[PDB]
Amino acid sequence: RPRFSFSIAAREGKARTGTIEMKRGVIRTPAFMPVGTAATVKALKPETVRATGADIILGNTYHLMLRPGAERIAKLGGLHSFMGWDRPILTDSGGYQVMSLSSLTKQSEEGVTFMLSPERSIEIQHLLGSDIVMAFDECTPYPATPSRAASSMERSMRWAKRSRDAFDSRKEQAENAALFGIQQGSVFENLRQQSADALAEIGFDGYAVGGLAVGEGQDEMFRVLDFSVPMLPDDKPHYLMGVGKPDDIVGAVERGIDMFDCVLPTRSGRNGQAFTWDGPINIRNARFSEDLKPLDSECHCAVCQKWSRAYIHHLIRAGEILGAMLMTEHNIAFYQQLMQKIRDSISEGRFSQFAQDFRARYF
Amino acid sequence: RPRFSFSIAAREGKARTGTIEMKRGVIRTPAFMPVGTAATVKALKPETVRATGADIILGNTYHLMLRPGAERIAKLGGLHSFMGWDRPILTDSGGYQVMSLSSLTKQSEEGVTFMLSPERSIEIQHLLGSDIVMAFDECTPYPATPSRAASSMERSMRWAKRSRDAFDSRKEQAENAALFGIQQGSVFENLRQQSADALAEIGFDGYAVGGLAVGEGQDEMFRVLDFSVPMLPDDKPHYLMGVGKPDDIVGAVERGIDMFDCVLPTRSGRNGQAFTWDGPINIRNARFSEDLKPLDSECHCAVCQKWSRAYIHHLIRAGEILGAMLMTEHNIAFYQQLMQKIRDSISEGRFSQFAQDFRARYF
Ligand SMILES: [Zn+2]
Ligand SMILES: [Zn+2]
């Protein structure tokens, strides 16, 4: 396969379905990437992640650069070998979690100390053996004044250029991995446009829409996506970082998004929330104590093929590890099934109808 | 298959190897039973438990009678259906954990309130759908004076008779399940003899050697087994309750034991202890941070086929669920491999040599 090749097979309105071919495998789009925190998709073996239908996973960098360490993972053979996932892996820049999980943070034009700079971020992702490298930037806080949103976006664009050059200066990385730039600008159209133009000028393999997983509310997110996605190069993948609620995904795809990631499936799974076509349920609720039906009546996952809600209800309330394992497998499978239905409906030119039907039942 | 049929295929000294045929499957002896607390072998799907080589698992009763409840599990279709394990299951009487996990316990000749009686215990195991039912007794504390050991043993024998009658009064249970009596008597030979005679007089499908997983030290346990096991009927299975350290198992088999169970493999696994032929290791130790070798160099389990000690070291130190899953699968597989080596060496008449070789390396 080539280093990177995104091809669009079918369209409907702003929605697209196709594939991204990379050295370690093919990624079907629109795609959902399970999140792997600390070199593991919580409670799941990689074979199980693959079994659910995942083509690629997201590897959090912040955690790995600290524990066990980027240089160490490299010495050990890379993240793929380390965790046992031989397919594509997209890594975040690690800058986000720095401004959320660390302390005494000191930001400057050079980078952030807590010294993670654009150059070091790219190098860390290189050491991890990332297939899709994310440019290092700043996820603008919400809400943000136009002045502050502009300053952060402008800085991120300067960092986008530095990320590009750092990535290109490393032969092995430039020839085997891909680089995505990130659009910033908060909820302001003029800033989003300036960011999109700056990114396109630099040139990237893919474009992410950053700064929209900040609790602005679905309506606002959709409004921003309405004018933001069209600004990005049409022939390259569009990645909406950190977005994952089922209805959010459907609406984003309707607006031109090709890639997604979020901890909702995994984290909520361990907390007792199971996704179903009739909306999410909290398996811990007493009404499931003697419910022999599977988590979801139509789901084709192994969990719904073998265990009842009653059993999983028992497991979660007892704090049993198998509870987390089963809820997580089902939720990730549910997400992958959602992406499959989305891809097929688009290919068949009935995605708009699918979106309508999905919402009517889910709500 | 028949309700119950134990056949001895080969012998060497006091050691025996054979099979126990039951309606839900065949059990190869000597056998190790993984412990399922709260209707689950912690951190493992039943298919994984089976994959390691387990023919039967032990279902703790105390927990299930409280949560989710015996009548409820029955209503839901039984423990097998509930947890997804369709092979034999041996259930403890639940009386042990009562004197360890509850409070304001009140013991009498009728039973124990915290009202679990011999009759209720048998009924609970029936509701759970147990294949091998354990008589309800009292696990004599260690150390114990001869007077106290005798009183407890005598009471347990009266309860053994009550357990037998309760089991026999229920047609469905008497025709599809088996009943094991438990030898008590602390470390006193005369009491062990009296208990063995009382049990044999009543008649059971199997005989357990109870009261020896109380921290008396291996030497003392072996000394007691030396004269205790020969007292039990030779043509029925001999079950050493709660014993599981690898070297303990080998020594017990050398003394006539056919069945074992213990939480060591699972519990220690989650705590970071991994069993290897060269002795146990604590994967959390810094010396494994960059060790690319599998948990054990010879182990044929899936974990040793795919992941390094370095990765598992990372997982456990990070408190990741996959860490518990991997350590547990390996440890249970290691135990099953130990039982396989024991069975084969006995069948080949070289068990004594195997025992010697095992100890030399393990220590
Ligand atoms: Zn499912
Ligand atoms: Zn192993």
Curated annotation (Swiss-Prot), chains A, B:
The protein, known as: Queuine tRNA-ribosyltransferase
Any one Gene Ontology molecular-function term assigned to this protein's record: metal ion binding
Binding positions (Zn(2+)): 299, 301, 304, 330
Pathway(s) the chain acts in: tRNA modification; tRNA-queuosine biosynthesis
Catalytic activity: 7-aminomethyl-7-carbaguanine + guanosine(34) in tRNA = 7-aminomethyl-7-carbaguanosine(34) in tRNA + guanine
Record's GO cellular component terms: cytosol
Gene: tgt
One Gene Ontology term from the biological process aspect of the record: queuosine biosynthetic process
InterPro entries: ArchSynthase1/Queuine_TRR, TGT, TGT-like_sf, tRNA_ribo_trans-like
Positions of region (RNA binding): 242-248, 266-270
SUPFAM superfamilies in the cross-refs: tRNA-guanine transglycosylase
Active site: 92 (proton acceptor), 261 (nucleophile)
Signal peptide per UniProt: none
Organism: Zymomonas mobilis subsp. mobilis (strain ATCC 31821 / ZM4 / CP4)
Subunit structure: Homodimer. Within each dimer, one monomer is responsible for RNA recognition and catalysis, while the other monomer binds to the replacement base PreQ1.
Cofactor: Zn(2+)
Cited function: Catalyzes the base-exchange of a guanine (G) residue with the queuine precursor 7-aminomethyl-7-deazaguanine (PreQ1) at position 34 (anticodon wobble position) in tRNAs with GU(N) anticodons (tRNA-Asp, -Asn, -His and -Tyr). Catalysis occurs through a double-displacement mechanism. The nucleophile active site attacks the C1' of nucleotide 34 to detach the guanine base from the RNA, forming a covalent enzyme-RNA intermediate. The proton acceptor active site deprotonates the incoming PreQ1, allowing a nucleophilic attack on the C1' of the ribose to form the product.
UniProt effect for mutating residue 137 to A: Abolishes catalytic activity
Cited PANTHER family: QUEUINE TRNA-RIBOSYLTRANSFERASE (PTHR46499:SF1)
Record note on cofactor: Binds 1 zinc ion per subunit.
